[PDB]
Ligand binder design. Structure first.
Ligand SMILES: [Mg+2]
Ligand SMILES: [Mg+2]
Ligand SMILES: [Mg+2]
Ligand SMILES: [Mg+2]
Ligand SMILES: [Mg+2]
Ligand SMILES: [Mg+2]
Ligand SMILES: [Mg+2]
Ligand SMILES: [Mg+2]
Ligand SMILES: [Mg+2]
Ligand SMILES: [Mg+2]
Ligand SMILES: [Mg+2]
Ligand SMILES: [Mg+2]
Ligand SMILES: [Mg+2]
Ligand SMILES: [Mg+2]
Ligand SMILES: [Mg+2]
Ligand SMILES: [Mg+2]
Ligand SMILES: [Mg+2]
Ligand SMILES: [Mg+2]
Ligand SMILES: [Mg+2]
Ligand SMILES: [Zn+2]
Lengths: 139, 30, 115, 148, 100, 81
RNA sequence: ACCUCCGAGGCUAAGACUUCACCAGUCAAAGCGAAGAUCCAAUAACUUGACCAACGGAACAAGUUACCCUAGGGCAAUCCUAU
RNA sequence: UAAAUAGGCUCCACGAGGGUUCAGCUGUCUCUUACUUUUAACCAGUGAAAUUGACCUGCCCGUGAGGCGGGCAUAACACAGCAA
RNA sequence: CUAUGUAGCAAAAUAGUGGGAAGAUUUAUAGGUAGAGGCGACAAACCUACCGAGCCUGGUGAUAGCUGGUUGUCCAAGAUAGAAUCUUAGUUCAACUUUAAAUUUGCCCACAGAACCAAAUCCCCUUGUAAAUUUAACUGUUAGUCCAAAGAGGAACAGCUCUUUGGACACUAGGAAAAAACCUUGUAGAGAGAGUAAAAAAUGAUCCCAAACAUAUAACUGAACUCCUCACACCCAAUUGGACCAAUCUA
RNA sequence: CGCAAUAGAUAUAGUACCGCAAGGGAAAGACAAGCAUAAUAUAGCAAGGACUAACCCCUAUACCUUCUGCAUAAUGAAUUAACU
C-alpha cells in the first residue's frame, strides 16, 4: 500500500453533520445519509420559489379578510387603489390590515370612493368632468 | 368524427359565426 | 408537409377603415419601428429562431429599434406573430449630441428628452 | 439548512444607533509568524496596512504577536462578549484587508438565519387588530336572539 | 442520379464547367455552351450564365424533329429554352514587348 | 376525454393575440423607402463592421511575457529578520 | 420497401460532375496524330482469364441437436348481435 | 350400465406391466364426529437460516399503485391465526 | 404404491405396503481395466456426492462484437442524413460535436432565372446580422419516441410497417388532475417586491366520486418569462476544453 | 521519492483444516455499524418552507445501471470498516 486516504473520517463527517437531526438509520449510516441529505439540499434550493409564492398568497388572503371586513372584495381594493396611483404593495397592505386598522379603513374607503367614481363616470354620456379622485398625476 | 388538435379547436371556437341581432324582436313587432 | 409560409401581399394593404383606427397615415410614413417580442422562439421552426436572433430580439419584451424599409419588413413578415411592432414617435425631434444621455421612451412609443 | 440550523431574531447590542452609534469590535489579535510561508500575506498586512486600520478605528485595541511560529490567525473580540476567529493562513493582503474590515464592520452576534428582516418594538400605532375592531355594537349590548 | 441544373442564372462559370446534366433535352445549348455525348451542357467560354427562350429550327439531318415541324399550322413555331454564357473577359490585350 | 371544451378565457386570450397581430399587419403596409431607394445606403457601415470582425479575428497571438512576473515568484520565501 | 410494373452480364490535357463515405464511375475546350476489386499463377511482352452472381469478393466447408452447455435479450375491410 | 367417447398367426405358465368387470369390504364419499400421541400455546434452559434500498408500511376510483391525483379513514401497543 | 420429511435423522432417509430370497442370488478380502479411455443384461448408465465425457496442476491474467462495474470540486461547448460489411447486439468511412490556428466572407433575402410530359424548393444584389470557410488534432453518437402535415402498406381501421417537412423529448420552469411528446417559457445567484404568459365547459362487473353555487357591475389570480435592489463562470446524455484540489513520498 | 499485520512472501505455515490422491490452503500479534442510558401517539421516500411550538399547515413519484423517456418496467445494494 503506497497511498491510502488517511482522512476519510472528515469527508464522512462533512455529510453526517447535516444529518444528525434526521430520523432512522439514515442519520448515522453514510450510504443513506448522503441520499437524504442531497434530497434535503435540493428541496432547500427549490423551496425559495415556493417561499415567495406562499407569502404572497398569505398576504392576499389576509388582505381579502380585512377588505371583506369593510364590505369590499379584494378585486376592488387592488384594482381600484392603483387607479388612485397608490403603489402600496401587498406585504405592507397586510401589515396595515393587522397592525393599523384605521389606516386600512381609510384605504378601503378610498378604494370604494374610486370604484363609485368609475361606475358613475361609465354610466354617464361622454366625458363629463372626471371624479375628484380619478384625476391622474403625470410624471 | 375524429378529435382535433387543441389549437385547431380554439381556432374553430373563436372564428364561430355570430349572427346580426335583429333590430326588434318579431314577436312584439312585425 | 409543413413549409415556410408566403403571405399574400393583399393582407398588407391598409384600407380607409384601418387608417383612422390606428394613429397612422398613408403619406409621410414613419421612420423607425420599435419592436418587442411577446412570444417564445421555442416550439417554432428554426427559420424563425434565426430571424429573431438576427433582429436582436433574443431577450423578452426589451424593446429594440429597426428601420422601416422593406429589407427588414420581409424579415418581420415571417415573425409577425411573435412580435409587437409600434411606430417610434419623435414629437421633439432627434436628440443632439447633448441630450443623448437624458432621453426616455414612454409606453406610447414617444422618445423624449429629460423625462 | 434552516431546519438543521439554529436561528435568532433581528437585533442589536444595546440599541446601538438609538442614542449614539458605538463600534462593537473592541479587540483584534493578529498572530503572524516571522518565517512561515503561510504568514506572508499577514506580514504584508502588518507591514503596510495595520497602522492605517488602527488610525481609522481608535476604539479597537489591536495586538500583534509573533509566536504561533507556523500558522497565523486573527481573533476578534466584541463588546457583547462574543469571540470570532478567522484563518488568514495562505491568504493575500487584499483578502486580509477585506476580512479585517468585515470583522470591524459587524456586531458580534451569531451569523445565523435571521427569522424576520424587520424588528420593531412598537409595531402598532392605532391599536393591534382584535376581532372586535370593525364590528358594531347593539342597544344595551344584547346577544343575537335575546329578549330583555 | 442528379440530372438537374448545377449552375443557375447569374453564376460565374469557367471553361469546361458543367452547366446542366440532363436525361432528355430539357435545356438546349446556346452561345458558348457545348454538349457532350450524354447531353451534358458545359461552358466553353468563361463568363456568366443566362437562360432564354428562343425559336427552334432542328437540323434537317435529324429526322424525328424535321418532320414534326412539318406538322404545324401556318404561323406556328416551336419555342424552347437555351442556356448561354455571356463571356466576361476579352480575348487578350497588347503590351509593350520591345522598344527598338 | 380526448376532446376538450374550449373555455371563454382561452377565446379571450386568442382574440388578444389576434388583435396584436392585426395591428402588426397594419404597421407593415407602409414602408419609408422602396426596394430600389434603399439599395446601398448601409454599405459603408456593413463593410466597416465586417472589417472590425476581420481585424479582431486576425489579431490572436500569445500574450507577452515579462521578467518581472517570473522573478516575483521568489517572493514565496520572503522573511522578516 | 418481401410497395407498385419490366431487361442486361488513337495519344495527351485546362476545367468540372457523381449514385449522399471511400473504391469505382462520368463529360470535356484547346494541342498532337489518323479519318466484378486485391492476390496468384502462363507469360519476354504488348499484358491475361474462369470462379469471385452470397455480384465490396473467406483460395477450398453441408444436414442436424427431444441429451445439449455457456453469454445474453424477451373505433374491423369480411363479420356476431340489438334499435 | 338407469344412462358407455371406456371394456368385449391360436399358443399353457409367469408379470409390483397396461385396460375392463363380478362380489365383498370399508370415513373414499353422501357428511362429517369423538378420543389418544406428536406438533401445538405458556413457563425455564440453549439458540439458527433463507430474506433485508430506506420506511413514520391504510381503503376506493382515475392515471399509467401502500407511496402520483381526487375522495374516505385514522390515538399507540403486544399475542395467536389466515393466506387476498 | 402411498404418507411423513424438503436446511430434513439423511446433499435421497423414516413408516407401512411390496419383488426376490439354492440362485443369471447375496456378500467380506486382495488384484486388474484410466478419460475420446475404461465398463456397460444400451439408460448416454457408471467411473469418489455435480459425467453427451472425471479430477488436479500448467499454457492461463485463455478468449468473449455478451452482462456487470469504473472512485475529488467547479465552469463551459455539446444529439438522431447516409454507405459497405458471413453485416443490422459490432466495426470503418462520412454527417454532426469539441479544441487550437489561418483567412474572408457566411446566413436571411426581394427582382431575374430552372420542360417538354398544390404546399413549396433552388439561386443570388441589397438589408438585419457575425459568422462562415480552411488548416492541424483527437474521441463520442448513428439506424430513437410522441405530435401537426403529405404520401405508400394494412380500410379510408386496427393505436399498424415505411419515406418526407416541422416541433418537442432525452435540459429548466408554469399549466391541462395525475402527465417525457399538447399549451406557456429558456442562460441559471439573494429578496418576507411588481407586471404578465398559458390556464375554469356547454346542452356492466370492489365503492357514486371534489364540496357547492342559477344574477352585486370584471376585474383579479397565476412562472426560474420580464422589471425592480444587489451579485454573476455558477441547471443536458455520450464526448471535448479549462480552473482548482484532498491525502502520501522526495528536494 | 519499497510494504508495515486485509500490505509485504501463501507464511507465526506449506502447519491447521479440506481431498482417497495428484493436489488445495487459512487465520492471527500490539467510543464505526449494533445496542443501553431513553418503546410509541392520526398523515403517508420521512425532508424542506417554516413556527413561539417536536407533531399538526403547504410543497414533495427513493439511488445505481440498462431500454426512446420508464411511477419500481427490469438489475443491484441489510449496514459499518479496510481493499478494490
Ligand atoms: Mg408571481
Ligand atoms: Mg460518391
Ligand atoms: Mg480536340
Ligand atoms: Mg457476402
Ligand atoms: Mg453486399
Ligand atoms: Mg412386472
Ligand atoms: Mg422459550
Ligand atoms: Mg388501482
Ligand atoms: Mg401477527
Ligand atoms: Mg476478459
Ligand atoms: Mg455482434
Ligand atoms: Mg451549456
Ligand atoms: Mg444572392
Ligand atoms: Mg432570466
Ligand atoms: Mg498477510
Ligand atoms: Mg496471506
Ligand atoms: Mg456508535
Ligand atoms: Mg410498490
Ligand atoms: Mg435484491
Ligand atoms: Zn311578444
Amino acid at each position: 500500500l503506497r497511498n491510502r486516504v488517511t482522512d476519510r473520517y472528515f469527508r464522512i463527517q462533512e455529510v453526517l453533520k447535516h444529518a444528525r437531526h434526521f430520523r432512522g438509520r439514515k442519520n448515522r449510516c453514510y450510504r443513506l445519509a448522503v441520499r437524504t441529505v442531497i434530497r434535503a439540499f435540493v428541496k432547500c434550493t427549490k423551496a425559495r420559489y415556493l417561499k415567495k409564492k406562499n407569502m404572497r398568497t398569505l398576504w392576499i388572503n389576509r388582505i381579502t379578510a380585512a377588505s371583506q371586513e369593510h364590505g369590499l372584495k379584494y378585486p376592488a381594493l387592488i384594482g381600484n387603489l392603483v387607479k388612485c396611483q397608490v403603489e402600496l404593495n401587498r406585504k405592507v397592505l397586510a401589515d396595515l390590515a393587522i397592525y393599523e386598522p384605521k389606516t386600512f379603513k381609510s384605504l378601503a374607503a378610498l378604494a370604494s370612493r374610486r370604484r363609485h367614481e368609475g361606475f358613475a363616470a361609465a354610466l354617464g354620456d361622454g366625458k363629463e368632468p372626471e371624479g375628484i379622485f380619478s384625476r391622474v398625476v403625470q410624471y | 368524427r375524429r378529435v382535433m388538435h387543441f389549437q385547431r379547436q380554439k381556432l374553430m371556437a373563436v372564428t364561430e359565426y355570430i349572427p346580426p341581432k335583429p333590430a326588434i324582436h318579431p314577436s312584439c313587432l312585425p | 408537409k409543413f413549409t415556410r409560409s408566403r403571405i399574400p401581399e393583399k393582407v398588407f394593404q391598409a384600407s380607409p377603415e384601418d387608417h383612422e383606427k390606428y394613429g397612422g397615415d398613408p403619406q409621410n410614413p414613419h421612420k423607425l419601428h420599435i419592436v418587442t417580442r411577446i412570444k417564445s422562439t421555442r416550439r417554432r421552426p428554426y427559420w424563425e429562431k434565426d430571424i429573431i436572433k438576427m433582429l436582436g430580439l433574443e431577450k423578452a419584451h426589451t424593446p429594440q429599434v429597426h428601420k422601416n424599409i422593406p429589407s427588414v419588413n420581409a424579415k418581420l413578415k415571417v415573425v409577425k406573430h411573435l412580435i409587437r411592432i409600434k411606430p417610434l414617435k419623435l414629437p421633439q425631434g432627434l436628440p443632439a449630441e447633448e441630450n443623448m444621455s437624458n432621453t426616455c421612451l414612454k409606453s406610447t412609443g414617444e422618445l423624449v428628452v429629460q423625462w | 439548512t434552516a431546519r438543521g440550523t439554529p436561528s435568532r431574531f433581528l437585533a442589536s447590542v444595546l440599541h446601538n444607533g438609538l442614542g449614539r452609534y458605538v463600534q462593537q469590535l473592541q479587540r483584534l489579535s493578529f498572530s503572524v509568524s516571522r518565517d512561515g510561508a503561510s504568514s506572508r500575506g499577514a506580514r504584508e498586512f502588518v507591514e503596510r496596512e495595520v497602522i492605517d486600520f488602527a488610525r481609522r478605528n481608535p476604539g479597537v485595541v489591536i495586538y500583534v504577536n509573533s509566536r504561533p511560529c507556523c500558522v497565523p490567525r486573527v481573533v476578534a473580540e466584541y463588546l457583547n462578549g462574543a469571540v470570532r476567529e478567522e484563518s488568514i493562513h495562505c491568504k493575500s493582503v487584499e483578502e486580509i484587508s477585506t476580512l479585517v474590515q468585515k470583522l470591524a464592520d459587524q456586531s458580534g452576534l451569531d451569523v445565523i438565519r435571521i427569522r424576520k428582516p424587520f424588528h420593531t418594538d412598537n409595531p402598532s400605532i392605532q391599536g393591534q387588530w382584535h376581532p372586535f375592531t370593525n364590528k358594531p355594537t347593539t342597544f344595551r349590548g344584547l346577544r343575537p336572539r335575546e329578549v330583555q | 442520379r442528379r440530372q438537374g441544373i448545377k449552375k443557375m442564372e447569374g453564376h460565374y462559370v469557367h471553361a469546361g464547367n458543367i452547366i446542366a446534366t440532363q436525361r432528355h433535352f430539357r435545356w438546349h445549348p446556346g452561345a458558348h455552351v457545348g454538349v457532350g455525348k450524354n447531353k451534358c451542357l458545359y461552358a466553353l467560354e468563361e463568363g456568366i450564365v443566362r437562360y432564354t427562350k428562343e425559336v427552334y429550327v432542328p437540323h434537317p439531318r435529324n429526322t424525328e424533329a424535321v418532320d414534326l415541324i412539318t406538322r404545324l399550322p401556318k404561323g406556328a413555331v416551336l419555342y424552347k429554352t437555351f442556356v448561354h454564357v455571356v463571356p466576361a473577359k476579352p480575348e487578350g490585350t497588347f503590351k509593350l514587348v520591345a522598344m527598338l | 376525454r380526448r376532446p376538450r371544451f374550449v373555455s371563454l378565457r382561452a377565446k379571450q386570450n386568442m382574440i388578444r393575440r389576434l388583435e396584436i397581430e392585426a395591428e402588426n399587419h397594419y404597421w407593415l403596409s407602409m414602408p419609408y423607402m422602396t426596394r430600389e431607394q434603399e439599395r446601398g445606403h448601409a454599405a459603408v457601415r456593413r463593410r466597416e463592421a465586417f472589417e472590425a470582425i476581420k481585424a479582431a479575428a486576425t489579431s490572436k497571438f500569445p500574450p507577452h511575457r515579462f521578467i518581472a512576473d517570473q522573478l516575483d515568484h521568489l517572493n514565496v520565501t520572503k522573511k522578516w529578520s
